[PDB]
């Protein structure tokens, strides 16, 4: 039942270059359930005939203008080679946004197309009636903002994808849309502090990665109070799981956080001498092979984050205090912890000579008591029963504790700047009804994946479980429980991999936590208990190469191999109490507030707990999903890799979405919410307290004269199609006094 053009799985140009997965060919002969003789044209290289079975042949969508179809579902033929070609043609014409049911897909162009300027914001925000432009992320922003004010219910925009897909860039674009309000008038200062925060959060939190030159090394969540006619009034920012290990070491092709390069390269000579700023090559903490990020002007961002500090109401004392801590964090890595005498195996740690001259100058930059810190890095008081002993630290421990100071100072400074931001911006009353935004670090894969990547990929798995539960599991169950539709909706879940990773027991994070709670623990003993706590699952497997320390997980985006070397050390990377209480007693105001109020606390345990707390908040809101896709690995514009596109389409469930059109209606809201959203259609039916909400909704629907097939009444909700929601919003045009 197919036309004259087919897509081919077994073709000459696809068997020769499997990365491009399909060829388009015109059928010259054949029959139903017989072999077909056809020649391919879309790769014009092969001008000769060949044969293909009846299978491995899909319809083409030959006559469509792909620039006129905004949704994948609206295409006549929605098979894999059609969806791939549909997104390709639109992407080659610089149209990257394409909707799929509630989902919206955004493909990285790797260049500013100019489609997010202020003129585009105005055209998507205030064009009368409804959105009849092309799909966009401004689609999501306006629909979510309209839903917010129409029902008084919190919404949450959630971007997703892999590293370098455009999650953060889409987030910044939606903030620019929300911040645009030419209809009303407000005080600019709070909104300007929110927008000016984006540079400093990317300076302190982002760094060059082979997968993304501006990779966010932290997750971001934002609650927003967006005005009715646009404009941002209040907000709050939360950053979780900053990767402190990046402060110490980096791969050869990567950089540390941008702020180190902005400072060393952009600081004036007076500032360099003031905070003892060395060139980047003379910092052990800075990878000297890669000092340049292709898309970033480090000197331009340096003056950008300097002006941003003023918009966030940081006094000149605090700004100078921040640069001192940044330089102090860098200089601390130059302190060599030399091995000294009076050690058991000549292993005792100490700082001497030129290292102590550097150590004193670094502590002064960090505003710390030098000799009190030095004692905590060198001597270790222990208790063999009732015997107090002033033993020494081995060189290994003293060096880790020294680097631990630099990481905690940088980690807490990043949180303190955000906390300074929230004090100036958080709403005076509180957050009851808000606009949520989630900017999570995406899936990432390297030749060597440590705990930094393990946590990041686990966050992405939990989001997908929350995606599948909300969009597929809850929706399919809700329709059946309402009596609207009994449908056999089948999909791909990640419930088994999320269990063997995050459960209370019989999971990787559980085996990690128990290993760190032991007096004597090893990375290999942690992987050992993983191999047998539960091995009856294909989601966890011992790696094929070096299986004593390496393991791999069968993720939703493929298989990823991790190595446990350093898991315990990195999972227990908390500043010691005896060192933390020294930086608390600093006479410098900002340093004294970094650890203020502090007197279980493992990263993996305190980070999964925050994820659950954030999952509970977000699920109290109505979610909107943006699926960001990276079309190539070379970051080249107009570069299209069909094999990579298809992997992300399965991972983000863009193809599996299309089932949702078969699941009845697109609008589903309780009777009371519906009567409030369209109350002016029949005020006698909506504002009558002595009425039954199902009859009142029916009276309002029958007053709207909406056709019968465009709505339905469930047991406790009113369902209606995409056509019915458009009309009711339009009918609310009557003018009351």
| Known binding positions for Mg(2+) | 168, 216, 439
Interacting stretch for ligand ALF, rule CB under 6 A, among 51-59, 125-133, 161-169, 245-253? 161-169
Q: Which of 309, 441, 472, 665 binds ligand ALF (CB under 6 A)?
A: 441
Does position 205 interact with ligand ALF (CB under 6 A)? The reply is no
**C-beta closer to ligand ADP: residue 215 or 395:** 215
Nearest to 651 by CA among 369, 460, 410: 460
**C-beta closer to ligand ALF: residue 215 or 561:** 215
Kindly state the DSSP code that residue 709 receives in the 8-state scheme: G
Which residue is listed with tokens 């899936």?
A: 443
Residue 457, helix vs strand vs coil = helix
> CA-CA distance, 268 to 117, in Å (whole number)?
33
Per the CB < 8 A criterion, the answer to whether 190 and 424 are in contact is: yes
Interacting stretch for Mg ion, rule CB under 5 A, among 120-128, 164-172, 263-271, 486-494? 164-172
Nearest to 321 by CA among 270, 274, 279, 280: 274
Nearest to 348 by CA among 387, 369, 377: 377
Which position's Cβ is nearest ligand ADP?
Answer: 166
The number of residues that bind Mg ion (CB under 5 A) is 3
Min. distance of Cβ 201 from ligand ADP in angstroms?
A: 12
Which position's Cβ is nearest Mg ion?
Answer: 216
Min. distance of Cβ 169 from ligand ALF in angstroms?
A: 9
Tokens coding 244:
């402190």
Min. distance of Cβ 245 from ligand ALF in angstroms?
A: 16
User: Which residues does the annotation place in the binding site?
Assistant: 108, 161-169, 173, 212, 216, 439
Alpha-carbon dihedral angle through residues 316, 318, 319, 324, given to the nearest 10 degrees: 130
User: Which residues does the annotation place in the binding site for ATP?
Assistant: 161-168
Per the CB < 8 A criterion, the answer to whether 700 and 682 are in contact is: yes
Q: Which of 116, 147, 212, 556 binds ligand ALF (CB under 6 A)?
A: 212
The DSSP bridge pattern shows strands 558-563 and 349-350 to be: unpaired
Does position 168 interact with Mg ion (CB under 5 A)? The reply is yes
Q: Which of 70, 230, 436, 442 binds ligand ALF (CB under 6 A)?
A: 442
Does position 671 interact with ligand ALF (CB under 6 A)? The reply is no
Does position 168 interact with ligand ALF (CB under 6 A)? The reply is yes
Does position 453 interact with ligand ALF (CB under 6 A)? The reply is no
Residue 100, helix vs strand vs coil = strand
Binding site partner of 108, from ligand ALF, ligand ADP, Mg ion, none, Cβ cut-off 5-8 A by kind: ligand ADP
Alpha-helical segments (H) within 156-297? 167-178, 188-195, 197-205, 245-248, 258-266, 269-274
Q: Is 518 left (phi over 0), alpha (psi -120 to 50) or beta?
A: beta
Does position 604 interact with ligand ALF (CB under 6 A)? The reply is no
> CA-CA distance, 212 to 202, in Å (whole number)?
13
**C-beta closer to ligand ADP: residue 394 or 630:** 630
Binding site partner of 169, from ligand ADP, Mg ion, ligand ALF, none, Cβ cut-off 5-8 A by kind: ligand ADP
Binding site partner of 112, from ligand ADP, Mg ion, ligand ALF, none, Cβ cut-off 5-8 A by kind: ligand ADP
User: Which residues does the annotation place in the binding site for ADP?
Assistant: 108, 164-169, 173, 212
Per the CB < 8 A criterion, the answer to whether 405 and 363 are in contact is: no
Q: Is 615 left (phi over 0), alpha (psi -120 to 50) or beta?
A: alpha
Interacting stretch for ligand ALF, rule CB under 6 A, among 34-42, 210-218, 551-559, 700-708? 210-218
**C-beta closer to ligand ALF: residue 216 or 223:** 216
Residues 186-245 contacting Mg ion, CB under 5 A: 216
Nearest to 115 by CA among 92, 138, 131, 98: 138
Interacting stretch for ligand ALF, rule CB under 6 A, among 103-111, 208-216, 226-234, 253-261? 208-216
**C-beta closer to Mg ion: residue 27 or 415:** 415
Query: b/e for 276-311, b at 16 or more Cβ within 10 A?
Result: bbeebeebebbbeebbebeebebeebbebbbebbeb
**C-beta closer to Mg ion: residue 9 or 444:** 444
> CA-CA distance, 660 to 100, in Å (whole number)?
9
Min. distance of Cβ 272 from ligand ALF in angstroms?
A: 30
Which residues here bind ligand ADP, judged by CB under 6 A? 108-112, 161, 163-169, 212-216, 295, 442, 628
Min. distance of Cβ 208 from ligand ALF in angstroms?
A: 10
**C-beta closer to ligand ADP: residue 449 or 507:** 449
Does position 13 interact with ligand ALF (CB under 6 A)? The reply is no
Does position 171 interact with Mg ion (CB under 5 A)? The reply is no
Nearest to 427 by CA among 200, 610, 190: 190
**C-beta closer to ligand ADP: residue 92 or 577:** 92
Alpha-helical segments (H) within 76-215? 80-92, 118-125, 137-151, 167-178, 188-195, 197-205
Interacting stretch for ligand ALF, rule CB under 6 A, among 1-9, 211-219, 525-533, 591-599? 211-219
Per the CB < 8 A criterion, the answer to whether 675 and 697 are in contact is: yes
> CA-CA distance, 65 to 70, in Å (whole number)?
11
Does position 163 interact with ligand ALF (CB under 6 A)? The reply is yes
Tokens coding 706:
């909406």
**C-beta closer to ligand ALF: residue 441 or 674:** 441
The number of residues that bind ligand ALF (CB under 6 A) is 9
Residues comprising the chain, all counted = 737
Which residue is listed with tokens 């455009």?
A: 166
Query: b/e for 151-166, b at 16 or more Cβ within 10 A?
Result: beebbbbbbbbbbbbb
Does position 221 interact with ligand ALF (CB under 6 A)? The reply is no
Binding site partner of 734, from ligand ALF, Mg ion, ligand ADP, none, Cβ cut-off 5-8 A by kind: none
Instruction: Show the CA angle centred on residue 362, arms to residues 361 and 367, nearest 5°.
Output: 95
Per the CB < 8 A criterion, the answer to whether 717 and 480 are in contact is: no
**C-beta closer to ligand ALF: residue 314 or 651:** 651
What track of x and - describes contact with ligand ALF for positions 113 through 152 (by CB under 6 A)?
----------------------------------------
**C-beta closer to Mg ion: residue 205 or 714:** 205
Does position 215 interact with ligand ALF (CB under 6 A)? The reply is yes
Query: How far from the centroid of its chain's Cα atoms is residue 596's Cα?
Result: 29
> CA-CA distance, 524 to 512, in Å (whole number)?
11
Residues binding Mg ion (CB under 5 A): 167-168, 216
Residues binding ligand ALF (CB under 6 A): 163-164, 167-168, 212, 215-216, 441-442
């Amino acid at each position: 039942y197919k036309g004259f053009q087919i897509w081919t799985d077994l073709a000459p140009s696809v068997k020769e270059e499997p990365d491009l997965m399909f060829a388009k060919c015109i059928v010259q002969a054949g029959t139903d359930k017989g072999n077909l003789t056809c020649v391919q044209i879309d790769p014009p290289g092969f001008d000769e005939p060949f044969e293909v079975p009846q299978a491995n042949a899909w319809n083409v969508n030959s006559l469509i203008d792909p620039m006129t179809y905004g949704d994948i579902g609206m295409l006549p033929h929605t098979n894999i080679p059609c969806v791939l070609d549909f997104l390709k043609v639109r992407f080659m014409k610089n149209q990257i946004y394409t909707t799929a049911d509630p989902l919206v897909v955004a493909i990285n162009p790797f260049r500013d197309l100019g489609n997010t300027t202020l003129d585009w914001i105005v055209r998507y925000r205030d064009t009368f009636d409804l959105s009849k432009l092309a799909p966009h992320v401004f689609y999501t922003a306006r629909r979510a903002l309209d839903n917010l004010h129409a029902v008084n219910k919190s919404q949450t925009i959630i971007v997703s994808g892999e590293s370098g897909a455009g999650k953060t860039e889409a987030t910044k674009q939606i903030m620019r849309y929300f911040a645009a309000a030419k209809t009303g008038s407000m005080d600019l200062r709070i909104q300007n502090a929110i927008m000016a925060a984006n540079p400093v959060l990317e300076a302190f939190g982002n760094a060059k990665t082979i997968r993304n030159n501006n990779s966010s090394r932290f997750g971001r969540f934002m609650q927003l109070d967006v005005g009715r006619e646009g404009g941002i009034k209040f907000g709050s920012v939360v950053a979780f799981l900053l990767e402190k290990s990046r402060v110490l070491t980096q791969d050869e092709q990567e950089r540390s956080y941008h702020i180190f390069y902005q400072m060393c390269k952009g600081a004036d000579a007076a500032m360099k001498e003031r905070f003892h700023i060395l060139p980047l090559s003379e910092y052990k903490y800075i990878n000297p092979l890669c000092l340049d990020a292709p898309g970033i002007d480090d000197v331009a961002e340096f003056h950008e984050v300097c002006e941003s500090f003023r918009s966030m109401n940081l006094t000149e004392d605090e700004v100078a205090s921040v640069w001192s801590i940044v330089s102090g964090v860098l200089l601390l890595g130059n302190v060599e912890v030399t091995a000294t005498k009076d050690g058991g195996i000549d292993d005792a740690a100490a700082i001497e000579g030129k290292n102590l001259e550097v150590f004193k100058k670094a502590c002064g930059l960090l505003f710390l008591d030098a000799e009190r810190i030095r004692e905590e890095l060198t001597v270790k008081v222990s208790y063999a029963g009732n015997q107090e002993i002033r033993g020494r630290w081995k060189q290994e421990d003293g060096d880790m504790l020294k680097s631990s100071l630099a990481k905690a100072m940088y980690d807490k400074l990043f949180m303190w700047i955000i906390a300074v931001l929230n004090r100036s911006i958080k709403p005076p009353g509180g957050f009851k009804i808000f606009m949520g935004m989630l900017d999570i670090f995406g899936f990432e894969v390297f030749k060597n994946n440590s705990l930094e990547q393990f946590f990041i990929n686990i966050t992405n798995e939990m989001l997908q479980k929350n995606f599948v539960d909300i969009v597929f599991d809850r929706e399919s169950k809700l329709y059946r429980d309402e009596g609207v539709s009994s449908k056999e909706l089948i999909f791909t879940s990640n419930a088994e991999v999320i269990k063997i990773l995050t459960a209370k027991n019989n999971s990787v994070l559980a085996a990690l936590e128990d290993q760190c709670l032991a007096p004597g623990g090893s990375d290999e003993k942690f992987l050992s208990t993983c191999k047998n706590a539960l091995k009856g699952t294909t989601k966890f497997k011992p790696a094929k190469v070096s299986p004593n320390i390496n393991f791999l997980i069968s993720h939703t985006v493929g298989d990823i191999q991790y190595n446990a070397e350093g898991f315990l050390f990195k999972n227990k990377d908390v500043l010691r109490a005896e060192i933390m209480e020294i930086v608390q007693q600093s006479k410098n105001p900002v340093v004294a507030q970094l650890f203020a109020g502090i007197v279980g606390q493992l990263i993996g345990s305190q980070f999964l707990s925050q994820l659950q707390s954030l999952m509970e908040l977000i699920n109290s809101t109505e979610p909107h999903f943006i699926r960001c896709i990276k079309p190539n690995d070379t970051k080249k514009p107009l570069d299209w890799v069909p094999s990579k596109m298809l992997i992300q389409l399965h991972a983000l469930s863009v193809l599996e979405a299309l089932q949702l059109r078969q699941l009845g209606y697109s609008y589903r809201r309780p009777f009371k919410e519906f009567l409030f959203q369209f109350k002016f259609i029949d005020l006698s039916a909506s504002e009558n307290p002595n009425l039954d909400p199902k009859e009142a909704a029916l009276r309002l629907l029958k007053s709207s004269k909406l056709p019968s097939e465009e709505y339905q009444l469930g047991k406790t909700m009113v369902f209606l199609k995409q056509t019915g929601a458009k009309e009711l919003t339009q009918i609310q045009r009557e003018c009351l006094s």
